[PDB]
Symmetry: C2
Subunit: 168 residues, 2 copies
């Protein structure tokens, strides 16, 4: 099935993101606010234990990540996704690329934009309006996240947590 | 801070439950199909370490639980809650029982009844229609769940996973 690896921030940041997600993010009812660490992938069920297996080691050789949120931004015109930008760090970069090693082997490691999505699947007009009111909305939040979660997708598209991994 | 401790069954069972929750369960968009936690409670988010310790240990002396779902039933006329019934076991009972000891001690129960909700907060009439449909609708599913999750409630009522515990 489909697996995903993400970071779930403090609820203060989840609530913040949800105050906007409730109206502009179809994923609202699919998964809590989050920061993707690896593009979701397909993995064979009996080839999962080694998965969890590798994630533990990646986790053990890492430390809690500091997340400095500084502004709202978009991926347009590449994608009408609006999000809370997170200042990229070498730590974030290293974990992301490690998630493309071993049994999560390769095909990648890159231009990684750590972010917390607050809106997507927006028409261009939809997008202008939101980015508009969302531009004059300041944001200055910083925190440390000490774990990441492995998830799998349901038939309805939602995501369920399989295992949590502590950092360091 | 609100916490809940629950079991997330296989994808196959969640999807089955969701095919009904999508229609009849307000929790549909708040949390994936689950088998309750022990009742949810109000802990001081800052004394969450104790909690996590006590849980890790309870999980230590437990074992993967077998869930054999036998049918759809209801808690009427106490609550118009329609659910999928799991066969009660000493194991589920013992673990439920251990979730009310130590720092999680407080006044427990009223019949712990292993279940997965597919419908709730229903009017008497809609409840009558759904039970008439599901009560005799066949269901035979069996699986072994090897972990439980601790989660906390967001402002919007949805629940996010804080930590996962392996049984054994």
């Amino acid at each position: 099935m489909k697996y995903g690896i993400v970071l779930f921030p403090s609820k203060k940041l989840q609530d913040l993101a949800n105050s906007y997600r409730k109206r502009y993010d179809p994923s609202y009812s699919l998964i809590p606010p989050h920061l993707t660490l690896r593009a979701s992938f397909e993995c064979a069920e009996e080839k999962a234990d080694q998965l969890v297996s590798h994630l533990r080691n990646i986790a053990k050789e890492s430390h809690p990540l500091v997340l400095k949120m500084t502004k709202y931004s978009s991926f347009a015109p590449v994608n009408n996704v609006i999000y809370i930008k997170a200042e990229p760090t070498e730590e974030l970069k290293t974990l992301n690329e490690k998630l493309y090693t071993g049994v999560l082997a390769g095909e990648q490691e890159y231009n990684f934009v750590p972010h917390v999505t607050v809106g997507q699947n927006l028409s261009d007009d939809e997008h202008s309006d939101v980015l508009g009111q969302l531009k004059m909305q300041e944001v200055s939040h910083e925190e440390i996240v000490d774990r990441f979660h492995l998830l799998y997708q349901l038939e309805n598209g939602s995501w369920t947590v399989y295992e949590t991994f502590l950092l360091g």
